[PDB]
Homo-oligomer: 99 residues x 2
């Protein structure tokens, strides 16, 4: 793809049966998706946000299919308002910022 930023980079992603969209976001270090039912061992990690501390839970080698590319990344699942796909999975579908 080639995405332009006239309007929030919302791309739809598939993660385990499950589809949904979230922002491609070079802001963030971490990918964080809304409460979903992933399988495996998970650690609990504390993320911040207006008020602050939110406990999401960290899944670890979770595949993600991002607007047709596959990738393996540590996804944090939890009470997030918006889906976000950090630099962490950015890196992997091999996104670059240009101009």
């Amino acid at each position: 793809p080639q995405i332009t930023l006239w309007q929030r980079p919302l791309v739809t992603i598939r993660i385990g049966g499950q589809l949904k969209e979230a922002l491609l976001d070079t802001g963030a270090d971490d990918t964080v998706l809304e409460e979903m039912n992933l399988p495996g061992k998970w650690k609990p990690k504390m993320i911040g946000g207006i008020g602050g501390f939110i406990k999401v839970r960290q899944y670890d080698q979770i595949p993600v299919e991002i607007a047709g590319h596959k990738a393996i990344g540590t996804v944090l699942v939890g009470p997030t308002p918006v889906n976000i796909i950090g630099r962490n999975l950015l890196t992997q579908i091999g996104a670059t910022l240009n101009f």
Copy 2:
């Protein structure tokens, strides 16, 4: 440029005498820089963040020189931890996300 995201997109920008760097960030709608001394009429705008409400102040047709391109954008100046150059100035140096 072509930026890769193996590591936070920090690019150095110049805004009024003043240089500094901030993230290129397709996350954010708004560009927000740390307290600096811009000239003109400014409105006061309330931005959020772990705890929450921060009062920055909005300058309006402020030029920005981003890693050699010029642009005219509404910059919000205030107690921000990190410089950020929203989609708002992204758009203008004509950044795109790719892969």
